[PDB]
Amino acid sequence: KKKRTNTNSVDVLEYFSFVCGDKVPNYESMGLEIYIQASKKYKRNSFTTKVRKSSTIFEVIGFALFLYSTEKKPDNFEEDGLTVEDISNPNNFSLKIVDEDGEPFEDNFGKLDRKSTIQSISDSEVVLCKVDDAEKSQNEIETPLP
Amino acid sequence: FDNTWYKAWHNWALANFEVISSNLIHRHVIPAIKGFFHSISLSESSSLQDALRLLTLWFTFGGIPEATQAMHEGFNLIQIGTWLEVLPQLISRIHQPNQIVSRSLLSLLSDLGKAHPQALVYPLMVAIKSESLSRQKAALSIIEKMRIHSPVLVDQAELVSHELIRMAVLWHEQWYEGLDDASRQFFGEHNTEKMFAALEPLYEMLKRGPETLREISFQNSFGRDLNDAYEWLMNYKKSKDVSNLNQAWDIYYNVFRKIGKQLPQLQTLELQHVSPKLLSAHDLELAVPGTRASGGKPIVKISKFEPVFSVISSKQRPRKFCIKGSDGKDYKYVLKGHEDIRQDSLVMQLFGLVNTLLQNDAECFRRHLDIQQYPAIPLSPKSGLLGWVPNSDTFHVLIREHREAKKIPLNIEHWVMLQMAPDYDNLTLLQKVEVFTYALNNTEGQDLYKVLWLKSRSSETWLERRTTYTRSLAVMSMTGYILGLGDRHPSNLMLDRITGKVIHIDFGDCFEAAILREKFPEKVPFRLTRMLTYAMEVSGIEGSFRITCENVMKVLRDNKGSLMAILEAFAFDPLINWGFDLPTKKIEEETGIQLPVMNANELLSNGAITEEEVQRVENEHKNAIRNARAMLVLKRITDKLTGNDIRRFNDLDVPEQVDKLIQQATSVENLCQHYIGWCPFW
Amino acid sequence: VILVSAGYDHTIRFWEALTGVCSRTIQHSDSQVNRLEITNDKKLLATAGHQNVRLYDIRTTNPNPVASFEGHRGNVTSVSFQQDNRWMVTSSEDGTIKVWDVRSPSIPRNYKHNAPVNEVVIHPNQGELISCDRDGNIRIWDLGENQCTHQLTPEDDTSLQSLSMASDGSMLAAANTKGNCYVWEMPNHTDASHLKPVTKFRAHSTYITRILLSSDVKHLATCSADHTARVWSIDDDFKLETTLDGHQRWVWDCAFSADSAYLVTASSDHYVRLWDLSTREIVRQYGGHHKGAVCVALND
Amino acid sequence: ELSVVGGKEMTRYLKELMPLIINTFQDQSNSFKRDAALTTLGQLAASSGYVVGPLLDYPELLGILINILKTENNPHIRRGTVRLIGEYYPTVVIHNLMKILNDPSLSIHHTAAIQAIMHIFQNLGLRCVSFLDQIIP
Amino acid sequence: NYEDEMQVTKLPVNQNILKNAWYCSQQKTKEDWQEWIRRLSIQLLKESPSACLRSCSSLVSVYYPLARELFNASFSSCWVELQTSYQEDLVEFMEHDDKPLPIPIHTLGKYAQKCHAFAKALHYKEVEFLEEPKNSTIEALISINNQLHQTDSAIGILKHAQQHNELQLKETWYEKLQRWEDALAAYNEKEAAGEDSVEVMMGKLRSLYALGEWEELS
């Protein structure tokens, strides 16, 4: 294809490989603690095997700048400046009973990829700064703080 | 038959002047105004206002030699003098199509613009940087006069016009940010042969290249190749356009990832590295880079300033501090970048209206104030030289040092909105009213007191900096309404760290904020951030709105008749304010009210060529998207604050122009609505 | 039985109005809370987005959108269903009163208001729509004519939040945002119908949300920002029948079940109360809410 | 000059008044006749020196106002005459000492050297509290 | 290496005991007070501000910043002390405490002025005028601000609180006619003030004078 060189898809949506067709894109279903239904949770725009669950939320500047509604979590909990994963949101492990597993934030986040739990149905955890210091400190290569 | 009181008897030369706008013979009988303007150009008539209508709404008539010999030679009897003002208007009015009496007045302006270009020449320092083509040729042959009139002063200010246009912002961040959006819609649209020359005119430029030592080289020395992978998009687009698809597929890419990795090193510069040319001026005469006001001062030099500047601090990036003026006086400046100094010249002109009509006023002149001509020249028609912003502190850092000293976030509102509201997205008017009046009852902004009240330092500098400001909400409060630009953003709502006086800064757009902005039709005079506009003064704008009742009443009627006509020639502001002031009330709710005052479509397809120029439609329709938005200051200064809008016509006088603001910073929720700039601070 | 709904909390909890517990337990997002009513057939209920109708077949508990219907800027001001049930006739925050066949995904007709429609309802004659405009103009839009006029302004410039007509054709009753509840009187007709002035009230001294003139048309259950769940009978009792207050209530409509003896306080206070209108006493208070409730569905 | 030496006489003041209070007869005051009457406002503040409140009242500062004949026309343009007049807080004071003690006419210049070595025992001290003071001290 | 200087501290009991001994007598406190502000000079043990005010020149102007040094340091210690915070009884040292340690003398702050009557504290009174704009504190604010001549907002908060706060009676007819305002209605506030004991009320008599006319007072 060209589906790599449009608007925000050289400034923000570069590492994603769009010319590459769907497995060099394995997609992503993020769902809030303000998913207050279970039917429109964050369906944009996959994983390049290469870029992490640092993908993902920075597409919540790139799900808030290709469906005009799932609100813009501001702006300093997304990301700082449009590269990688959410220093107050992780991803957390899904099981198979839709139990919102708070504690074992080290399968999908920044440490490894979000091609680390095979499934194109996960929820997430709330941060009370227990979650912010054993995840930005494992992530000084996956929060590119330019 | 005159022989008395000649100013009021010139309110006459003006009913014949406005009425007759060949017919007695009137080609004569113009002579009522033309010799009687010469009775009032005394000084009480300084009004340049009605002097332009004579040479403006005569530049339009032209006509027979009574043109110069009895009218313009009637001026050449007195003198320039007062044409220190309106010279940026005279460097816009450059083709007038009769040149034969007007080169001849442009010759005359070569003499007018040869005496005090020594001050200005700076309207010709701009002029030669943009085209005006056949009428910039006149501007270039008027340089012949400047090259006779000490070529020492004009060549120094030229050295730098250039050395600042050669320095202006960067070059390699600028060229790689003017490729960033160009061949982007050329790639995924296609624009094809449109943005085929939005990187071609950047090539030119790096024609001089590995140019100045350690920056216009360190980016083309290891940028020797930052050309070789353009000329594959050149040839073979001539020939394959899906085989060589794959080149704006690449060259696009490579240097972007470099641009960000190149935006955290764009602040501390040199100058040994880009301009060691502005390094080596050391001292020119003929700087006057912000003095230019009178001469008591005698033309400040530049005795410079840091090789190593300190840049803004925004996206735009035009080096803000101070460039040492020799009048031992550091010249305050923030250059201006890729812009328009006929907006900030009309932003000084119109601060020149207005403080001369703040001098003229009643009490309100013993208790006198005046809103501060902000120091700016146009470096390009797209650039400038601004002026340090002189003490202050703007409502974003002005709500910081509260919440700094107080330690309670700006989020808490938008986080007491992430608590009350999911946020405002969807949340119609009784709702946005709702989660307004719970993220407020809670909320308190006693801050303007508390920050007052740190200085204070008489326990009455509290009073003295306010009882300065109190009258300084009032003035540019009523100012920022009847005009426009209200601009709600906390960089606009600047406080003073000096006196506490009205600072607008970052001047948006000539017309008002409701039919703007689409981040809500925000309709308010301006804001009530209320306890920062309340705990400032006793009862929330009541001794202060006593004082908006002073300004409004005064500036409702004090000569509002004219005043108006040549504030309307901002009706037709030739090039910059044509240009920047149509696509003024923001064109996002405008173009659209009358597409079919006239025609536009089905005459641009049926003539062989009649689209180029078609004018009428579209260029005198952009002059009638103007004369249907401009008749519409004039019909928005006669039924709202003489001042038109609502249901409630007549005039609305003091009380009803007094409530048209208490209605609109309480009614209604319309004070709520704006957002990123509204930033709902009690 | 059915009701419902949610407020800021965004918790489509259907409970039953003749019982005590919870019918139908679905959290709500991706928009408010404009609309959570059961559709004329009372089965494909709208839960409402950016004009999203996603009709969740009250009978089958917890679904999946079944029949979108999306597409118009803003949010469906009100999803009336031209009882044909053939026509949805959505009055959105957009403006354009299209006029959805809610049995085919398309917009068959159009007519523009310049001053974000405020009110919509159907007269039940199929030849009517008595579509209202933030100016207030009740512009009588008949469903087979494209008529602006007939247009009449009850109160100029203050928005008509809320038009309630009757099932007859013997009223209306029209209350503006200011909470000034002009009562007009319809020659039950088709296409024309002349509005003829009984009584502007004071709604409310405060702000109206929507005055339904009952299933009965006997009351006028006038609910407000100031928390009151007032009912006002039809004849002369357009003079106070009730002031029903409460705590952050901001009850945002009314409903009448199937004898005008149950008022429902849709309030952001946590509670959707099924009171006892003629009896003014909370008979049935629902906890099924993180925070508030807005508008609202009581098809017995 | 007689405004400057009007102490060192009162008579150099009073007589200066009669060569305005009798130039008043024909000529007008407003010229400087505003500043020679504002150097009077001086020196009228400072009526505690130009000995009309202190020494003897000397029937004087009231031959002042009506010698400008300020009768029927007294306001306005005073505005045209504002025209003619043109923490480590413990270490802001550890200096406010040395700011004040910098006095030329000191009783003992040993109470500007006694008090200095009471900062030089000391902050001399932090060699940053010498290049801030002991370049200017 | 220089800077062997804690150097700043030291609290003064005994010494707050010797201030407690001389507050009965002095009562023109500026003599034995200033003696003792040489002893509130002695910060600690040694300093540059301590053996400093052993100076012979000792001026009241070094003594004022140095009367907060053995006091922001021994200060919040009620040891003798804030037991002797007010006594005590030319009053202008106070104003540097102030914005950043507060001190009580607010309600009595009529006392934060009556010692010098001026009504210098238009901001520790303006902190009590918004605290609660009381029915008698709004008009006491219409009084001490005709002094500051801020009437231009004391006919603000008199035209605001005649509109807003209730609807008042004796300060409204007297700052309306001060001033065209109520000229002949402050005189029609003689036709509803020939019942209020006309005589002294000068709102009803002035627009006969405020304004010739002298015929209504002949």
Numbering used by the authors:
A (entry chain J): 647 to 792
B (entry chain C): 1751 to 1771, 1814 to 2474
C (entry chain D): 3 to 302
D (entry chain C): 785 to 870, 915 to 965
E (entry chain C): 1207 to 1295, 1321 to 1449
Task: Paste lines from the article.
Biochemical purification of Tor1 and Tor2 from yeast demonstrated that Tor exists in two different multiprotein complexes named TORC1 and TORC210–12. TORC2 (mTORC2) is composed of Tor2 (mTOR), Lst8 (mLst8/GβL), Avo1 (hSin1), Avo2 (no ortholog), Avo3 (Rictor) and Bit61 or its paralog Bit2 (Protor1 or Protor2). From N-terminus to C-terminus, Tor contains two blocks of HEAT (Huntingtin, EF3A, ATM, TOR) repeats, a block of TPR (tetratricopeptide) repeats known as the FAT (Frap, ATM, TRRAP) domain, and the kinase domain, which includes the FRB domain inserted in its N-terminal part and the FAT C-terminal (FATC) domain19,31. Lst8 is composed entirely of WD40 repeats.
